[PDB]
Amino acid sequence: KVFGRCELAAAMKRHGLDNYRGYSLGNWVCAAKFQSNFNTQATNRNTDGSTDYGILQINSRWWCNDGRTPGSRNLCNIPCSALLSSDITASVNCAKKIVSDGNGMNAWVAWRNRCKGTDVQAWIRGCRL
Ligand SMILES: *[C@H]1O[C@H](CO)[C@@H](O[C@@H]2O[C@H](CO)[C@@H](O)[C@H](O)[C@H]2NC(C)=O)[C@H](O)[C@H]1F
Numbered sequence: 001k002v003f004g005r006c007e008l009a010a011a012m013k014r015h016g017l018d019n020y021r022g023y024s025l026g027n028w029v030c031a032a033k034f035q036s037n038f039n040t041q042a043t044n045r046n047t048d049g050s051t052d053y054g055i056l057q058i059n060s061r062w063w064c065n066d067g068r069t070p071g072s073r074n075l076c077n078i079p080c081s082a083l084l085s086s087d088i089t090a091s092v093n094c095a096k097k098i099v100s101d102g103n104g105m106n107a108w109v110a111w112r113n114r115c116k117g118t119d120v121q122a123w124i125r126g127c128r129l
């Protein structure tokens with residue numbers, strides 16, 4: 001599913017991400033935009049052999065099982081495929097664990113490089129919420 005901007009903002013809010021660990025909703029929307037273009041089915045291989053999955057490009061090295069990432073963990077206890085669903089529940093729940101891991105949203109490289117410190121509120125402008 002490719003979410004619209006406001007549609008994703010609303011879903012993220014309903015699943016408790018607005019201000020989760022102190023991160024306003026636009027931070028989440030911005031991170032999703034640059035990592036997946038709001039496409040739940042996005043996958044991208046990493047040089048180390050792991051793969052990123054879903055709207056928030058969650059990595060198989062630590063967070064989900066895809067059966068092909070040697071030495072990896074599955075800290076969110078889910079198949080990485082769950083992160084590709086039109087229902088963002090698994091992606092959100094896993095993202096809550098990731099953002100609580102110690103480094104906040106710096107766990108998402110694209111957020112650090114493209115969202116952090118910017119006017120992220122712009123990502124939820126005009127949205128009913
Ligand atoms: C694609 O992007 C994701 C998110 O930026 C990258 O995953 C990160 O990988 C680092 C190092 O392996 C890890 O410490 C982070 O926990 C992890 N974040 C997430 C959201 O999974 C991945 O390396 C890239 F392929």
Ligand code: NA
Nearest residue numbers: 060064072073
């Ligand atoms: Na894994």
